[PDB]
RNA sequence: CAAGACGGACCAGAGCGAAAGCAUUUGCCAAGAAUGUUUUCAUUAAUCAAGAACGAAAGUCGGAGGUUCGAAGACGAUCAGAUACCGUCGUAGUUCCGACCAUAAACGAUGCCGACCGGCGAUGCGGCGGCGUUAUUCCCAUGACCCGCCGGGCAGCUUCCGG
């Protein structure tokens, strides 16, 4: 039972199920949540820290660089993989696990990548969210040593090698489906769903492609055969001359380019909380807006705000009295 | 069992999807209601169940999702599931003055102000949330606060400059035992 | 001082046999006071009943207006008087970047009912379309509208009221119009939006018994 | 006094809540709409013209009509919300919202909510001038 | 820009340009030899014909006028002449 | 049931027109830009004193009509001095038909015609080239989409062209 930091984040109190509860010091010392650290000082201390012998750390690295998951994982994730590999080696025979992982098979379909399949509340033609389902909805849910890995790249390389992986649910996981991003310029895949520029070529060209791995060791990857996805409509537009100084917003063309700091005031990026027990004594139903700072005058916005505006293509007609900051 | 259905327009589908967990968690936890999103009919469907604590929880959930779909922040409509004297009155801009074209456009502009400042300042005085859909104005707050907000907004879209409206709205707030 | 609800009486109002659910509900009438009868006080009451309250499997945005036409001893036999969409559905279908195509026909059934049919359709954005707007041209709109009138008039003038109202429950006319208009401009959400009574025939008793059972 | 129905099936009425810009009406009636059961406007509760339109008077009227319905035996209500319409404002005020909320609170089963407001196809001239209206 | 052989444009460049805006004007039309499926008679039809050209020995329509190029009837064959 | 009005949402920096202007279906009537053309005439053209046609709203003469709104006007409220604001009512008007009137922030506060001087992709119409998807896998052309080009349009963005 090797606990990833996802188990500690999720407060998965599964120490009673297993007895081989082991983990790295690095994964538990990197957590920045206060409630998790408070919960760490309360829990019964049966977990033990170790560091794997570095030889299996190499071996895990040479097949992760072959399975297409090496840029996605962290060093600590390689530590978790090496620790569960060594605990498998010490407890169970080593002939069970296989190397040189199997080639992916390709099968495309017609659905758009943004089709909201596998989102809980949604229903095409019953699928309801009951008070009985909230504890149930975690992920796709289906002997001595297991894992508590929630990142998909972890489960991908584990089920590729053949280690039995389990979840916050006690029963082990048989099937794992998710989404990845693939570049249509250099065809290199990333398991990080947040990232918008490619790791290899650096272009803003990653598009969503679904994957599913079995417990057997098979990875099969579903494309979308929809011509909407690969269409260059608003991709060529003329760009302004590059501007410097404290207030310049260049159009963000490379991943590691340097922006001037334009942060919101602490008053502006505060949202109203109504579940607080001191809310009803508060004067207003809502937090006051910031209209007094310098960033209010400079019209600084939250980075997440104004997203559907960006997906409108620049060579198009906006209304005649609006201005796009 | 009784249910309500709340429509979603096409510009409110993606906000409904990103903010979905923040919608269905307080409805099902603190009110104990069933909820789904019918994609074929494009309706948010809210249904009573065995675990509902009391009557008029489902009306609270309906007002919550309605305020979200009109364009309010999810936190400002969690204010609807919590509080009892919060309503929403809306009107078109041409319900006050017949405006056509660029005049109408300027009306929207001088509701909002530069950077949105005017809007925010009105929200700071009347303690309301205003949302300006395409030609339409929606206010959220208490009853007397909503009528103060309408007075300020209607003065803005029958011509008066924002400075006059600022002074009038602060004076009216002072005389209202605020 | 005197309560007038003691003098009132409760009657059952019932849907005809064309819908699954019969008992659409209850109805007050002040009793007979010699001069005016309790019967003719309720001879012309119109009921806005949604379709989900008449059949279980159908959709609830449609409303049938049923007019009561006889009373049979705490039963009120009702006949079809109209249909319209829910205004929420009407508000939801009118989106911006598309063409609204409306049409209307004054069509007479075989048994003497003169009806006015209104049909609305919307141009459909295609599955690989990138252009924001989905407008039809004026000749395409006229062709679509002409075929809409043709389909409705051909679908009503050859049938009696019972068959027509049985094809207004699932909107067979709508599916026919969606299929037939694809060769001009593909259509998105067509419905017979409204059905009116322009003319009724002379009242008969055996006809209502046929429509009821 | 009322219908002779078992405890299972509900006897529906139709509730016309009309939220004017000076008061609010509550008209419970038959499914046909022809004969009326109860109607309590906002001014039947507050003895001041200023608060005819408040959500408080709307709440009180909702309690009154709900009480009268349990007197005569109506258990469930369909609701038709309404504002003035025509040339004037189309969206119902907080009076109709408060009446709906408090009436749902007071033991009524609620059926379908429908907005029957007079939207014109195309309108006559507005009561205001060209110069504007509402202060 | 600032260096362009105006004298010898590429044939792609000339074929793109409007028929007047070429270095020397040249039409985009042609006289095509049409061949009726029934008879053996060779006929010449202008590619942007405006009339309904009839067969001399069959009285069969060959092409219909359109906004631009005349559309040939189904079954007729043709070759562009010289 | 009737009367007179008005054609919302769809409706856009979309279209059309010389401008004022123009949005319910259908039919008739005569016009019109653009595009296409290896058609015809062959300088017939540009800009225009004088002179003419059209010209929002309001207004004025005759007839018809009056639903809504509503200058004048009547009231009610309001004050050291209020005679405008506000509410209810309401006349001419607002609608039509025939005459007049010829003015607007009648605006791009920007004559018209011709030429040259950077880039870009959206859109409206017409034309051309081309894989594919669709008309329940369309049997052929054809419409709806998709990719590029050309021409005249309504606009936009970008630029240290030069002013
Ligand atoms: Zn790449």
Swiss-Prot record, chain A:
GO terms for biological process: maturation of SSU-rRNA; rRNA processing; visual perception. One of its GO terms (molecular function) is RNA endonuclease activity. The keyword Repressor does not apply. Its EC number is 3.1.-.-. The keyword tRNA processing does not apply. Zn(2+) binds at residues 183, 186, 198, 201. It comes from the Eukaryota. It holds the Pfam family WRNPLPNID. Belongs to the NOB1 family. Interacts with UPF2. Component of the small ribosomal subunit, ribosomal RNA processing complex (SSU RRP complex). May play a role in mRNA degradation. Endonuclease required for processing of 20S pre-rRNA precursor and biogenesis of 40S ribosomal subunits. This is RNA-binding protein NOB1.
Swiss-Prot record, chain B:
Belongs to the PNO1 family. Residues 101-153 form the KH domain. This is RNA-binding protein PNO1. The chain holds residues 73 to 250 of 252 of the full protein. It is found in: Nucleus, Nucleolus. It comes from Homo sapiens. Part of the small subunit (SSU) processome, composed of more than 70 proteins and the RNA chaperone small nucleolar RNA (snoRNA) U3. The gene is PNO1. The keyword Manganese does not apply. The lineage of its organism: Eukaryota, Metazoa, Chordata, Craniata, Vertebrata. Keywords: Acetylation, Nucleus, RNA-binding.
UniProtKB/Swiss-Prot annotation, chain C:
There is a cross-link at residue 14 (Glycyl lysine isopeptide (Lys-Gly) (interchain with G-Cter in SUMO2)). The modification N6-acetyllysine is found at residues 14, 36. Belongs to the eukaryotic ribosomal protein eS1 family. Component of the small ribosomal subunit. The ribosome is a large ribonucleoprotein complex responsible for the synthesis of proteins in the cell. Part of the small subunit (SSU) processome, first precursor of the small eukaryotic ribosomal subunit. During the assembly of the SSU processome in the nucleolus, many ribosome biogenesis factors, an RNA chaperone and ribosomal proteins associate with the nascent pre-rRNA and work in concert to generate RNA folding, modifications, rearrangements and cleavage as well as targeted degradation of pre-ribosomal RNA by the RNA exosome. The keyword Plastid does not apply. Its main location: cytoplasm. GO terms for molecular function: mRNA 5'-UTR binding; RNA binding; structural constituent of ribosome. It comes from Homo sapiens (Human). ADP-ribosylated at Tyr-135 by PARP1 in presence of HPF1. It is found in: Cytoplasm; Nucleus; Nucleus, Nucleolus. Coiled coil: none annotated. GO terms for cellular component: cytoplasm; cytosol; cytosolic ribosome; cytosolic small ribosomal subunit; endoplasmic reticulum; extracellular exosome; focal adhesion; nucleolus. This is Small ribosomal subunit protein eS1. The chain holds residues 21 to 233 of 264 of the full protein. It comes from the Eukaryota.
Swiss-Prot record, chain D:
The modification Phosphothreonine is found at residue 117. This is Small ribosomal subunit protein uS11. It comes from the Eukaryota. Component of the small ribosomal subunit. The ribosome is a large ribonucleoprotein complex responsible for the synthesis of proteins in the cell. Part of the small subunit (SSU) processome, first precursor of the small eukaryotic ribosomal subunit. During the assembly of the SSU processome in the nucleolus, many ribosome biogenesis factors, an RNA chaperone and ribosomal proteins associate with the nascent pre-rRNA and work in concert to generate RNA folding, modifications, rearrangements and cleavage as well as targeted degradation of pre-ribosomal RNA by the RNA exosome. The lineage of its organism: Eukaryota, Metazoa, Chordata, Craniata, Vertebrata. Keywords: Cytoplasm, Isopeptide bond, Nucleus, Phosphoprotein, Ribonucleoprotein, Ribosomal protein, Ubl conjugation. It comes from Homo sapiens (Human). The gene is RPS14. It is found in: Cytoplasm; Nucleus, Nucleolus. There is a cross-link at residues 45, 47, 90 (Glycyl lysine isopeptide (Lys-Gly) (interchain with G-Cter in SUMO2)). GO terms for biological process: cytoplasmic translation; erythrocyte differentiation; maturation of SSU-rRNA; negative regulation of transcription by RNA polymerase II; ribosomal small subunit assembly; ribosomal small subunit biogenesis; translation. The modification Phosphoserine is found at residue 123. One of its GO terms (molecular function) is structural constituent of ribosome. Belongs to the universal ribosomal protein uS11 family. One of its GO terms (cellular component) is small-subunit processome. InterPro entries: Ribosomal_uS11, Ribosomal_uS11_CS, Ribosomal_uS11_sf. Residues 115-135 are annotated as: Disordered. Residues 126-135 have a biased composition (Basic residues).
């Amino acid at each position: 039972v090797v606990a990833d930091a996802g188990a500690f984040l999720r407060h998965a109190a599964l120490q009673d199920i297993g007895k081989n509860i082991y983990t790295i010091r690095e994964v538990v010392t990197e957590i920045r949540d206060k409630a998790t650290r408070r919960r760490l000082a309360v829990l019964p201390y049966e977990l033990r820290f170790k560091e794997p012998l570095p030889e299996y750390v190499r071996l895990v690295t040479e097949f992760s660089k072959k399975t297409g998951d090496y840029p996605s994982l962290s060093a600590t994730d390689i530590q978790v993989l090496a620790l569960t590999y060594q605990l498998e080696a010490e407890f169970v025979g080593v002939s069970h696990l296989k190397q040189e992982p199997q080639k992916v098979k390709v099968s495309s379909s017609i659905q758009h990548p943004e089709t909201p399949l596998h989102i809980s509340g949604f229903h095409l033609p019953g699928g309801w969210i009951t008070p009985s389902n909230i504890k149930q909805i975690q992920q796709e849910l289906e002997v001595r040593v297991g894992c508590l890995t929630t990142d998909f790249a972890m489960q991908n390389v584990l089920l590729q090698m053949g280690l039995h992986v389990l979840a916050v649910n006690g029963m082990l996981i048989r099937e794992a489906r998710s989404y990845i991003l693939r570049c249509h310029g250099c065809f290199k895949t990333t398991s990080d769903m947040s990232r918008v520029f490619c790791s290899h070529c650096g272009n803003k060209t990653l598009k969503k492609v679904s994957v599913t791995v079995s417990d057997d060791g098979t990875l099969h990857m579903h494309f979308s055969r929809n011509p909407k996805v690969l269409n260059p409509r608003g991709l060529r537009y003329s760009l302004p001359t590059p501007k410097g100084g404290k207030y310049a917003i260049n159009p963000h063309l490379t991943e590691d380019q340097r922006f001037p700091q334009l942060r919101l005031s602490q008053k502006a990026r505060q949202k109203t909380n109504v579940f607080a027990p001191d809310y009803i004594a508060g004067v207003s139903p809502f937090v006051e807006n910031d209209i007094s700072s310098r960033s209010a005058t400079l019209q600084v916005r939250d980075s997440t705000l104004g997203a559907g505006r960006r997906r409108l293509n620049p060579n198009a007609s906006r209304k005649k009295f609006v201005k796009k900051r | 069992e009784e249910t309500r259905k709340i429509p979603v327009p096409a510009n409110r589908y993606t906000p409904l999807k990103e903010n979905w967990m923040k919608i269905f968690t307080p409805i099902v936890e603190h009110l104990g209601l069933q909820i789904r999103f019918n994609l074929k009919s494009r309706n948010v469907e809210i249904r009573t169940c065995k675990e509902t604590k009391d009557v008029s929880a489902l009306t609270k959930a309906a007002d919550f999702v309605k305020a979200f779909i009109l364009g309010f922040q999810v936190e400002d409509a969690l204010a609807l599931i919590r509080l009892d004297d919060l309503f929403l009155e809306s009107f078109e801009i041409t319900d006050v003055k017949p405006l056509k074209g660029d005049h109408l456009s300027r009306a929207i502009g001088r509701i909002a102000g530069k950077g949105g400042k005017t809007k925010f300042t009105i929200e700071n005085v009347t303690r309301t949330r205003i949302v300006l859909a395409d030609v339409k104005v929606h206010i959220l707050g208490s009853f007397q606060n909503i009528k103060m907000a309408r007075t300020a907004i209607c003065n803005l879209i029958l011509g008066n400059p924002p400075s006059k409206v600022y002074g009038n709205i602060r004076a009216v707030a002072s005389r209202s035992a605020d | 001082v005197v309560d007038p609800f003691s003098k009132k009486d409760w009657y059952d109002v019932k849907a005809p046999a064309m819908f699954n659910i019969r008992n659409i509900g209850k109805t007050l009438v002040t009793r007979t006071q010699g001069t005016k009868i309790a019967s003719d006080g309720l001879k012309g009451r119109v009921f806005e009943v949604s379709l989900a309250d008449l059949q279980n499997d159908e959709v609830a945005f449609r409303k049938f207006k049923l007019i009561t036409e006889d009373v049979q001893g705490k039963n009120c036999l009702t006949n079809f008087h109209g249909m319209d969409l829910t205004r929420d559905k009407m508000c939801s279908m009118v989106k911006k970047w598309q063409t609204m195509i409306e049409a209307h026909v004054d069509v007479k059934t075989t048994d003497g009912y003169l009806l006015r049919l209104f049909c609305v359709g919307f141009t459909k954005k295609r599955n690989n379309q990138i252009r924001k707007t989905s407008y039809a041209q004026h000749q395409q709109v006229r062709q679509i509208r002409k075929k809409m009138m043709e389909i409705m008039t051909r679908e009503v003038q050859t049938n009696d009221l019972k068959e027509v109202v049985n094809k207004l429950i699932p909107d067979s006319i709508g599916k026919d119009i969606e299929k037939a208009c694809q060769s001009i401009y593909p259509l998105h959400d067509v419905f017979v939006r409204k059905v009116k009574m322009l003319k009724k025939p002379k009242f008969e008793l055996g006809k209502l018994m046929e429509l009821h059972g | 006094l009322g219908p002779q129905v078992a405890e299972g099936e509900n006897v529906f009425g139709v509730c016309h809540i009309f939220a004017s810009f000076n008061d609010t009406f509550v008209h419970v009636t038959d499914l046909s709409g022809k004969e009326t059961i109860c109607r309590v406007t906002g001014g039947m509760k507050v003895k001041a013209d200023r608060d005819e339109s408040s959500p408080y008077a709307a709440m009180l009227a909702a309690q009154d009509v709900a009480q009268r319905c349990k007197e005569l035996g109506i258990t469930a209500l369909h609701i038709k919300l309404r504002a003035t319409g025509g040339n004037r404002t189309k969206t119902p005020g907080p009076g109709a919202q408060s009446a709906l909320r408090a009436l749902a609170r007071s033991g009524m089963k609620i059926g379908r909510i429908e907005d029957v407001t007079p939207i014109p196809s195309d309108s006559t001239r507005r009561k205001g001038g060209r110069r504007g209206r509402r202060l | 820009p600032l260096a362009k052989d105006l004298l010898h444009p590429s044939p792609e460049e000339e074929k793109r340009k409007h028929k007047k805006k070429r270095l020397v004007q040249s039409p985009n039309s042609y006289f095509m030899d049409v061949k009726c499926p029934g008879c053996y008679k060779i006929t010449t039809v202008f590619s942007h014909a405006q009339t309904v050209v009839l067969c001399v020995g069959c009285s069969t329509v060959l092409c219909q006028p359109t906004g631009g190029k005349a559309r040939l009837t189904e079954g007729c064959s043709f070759r562009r002449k010289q």
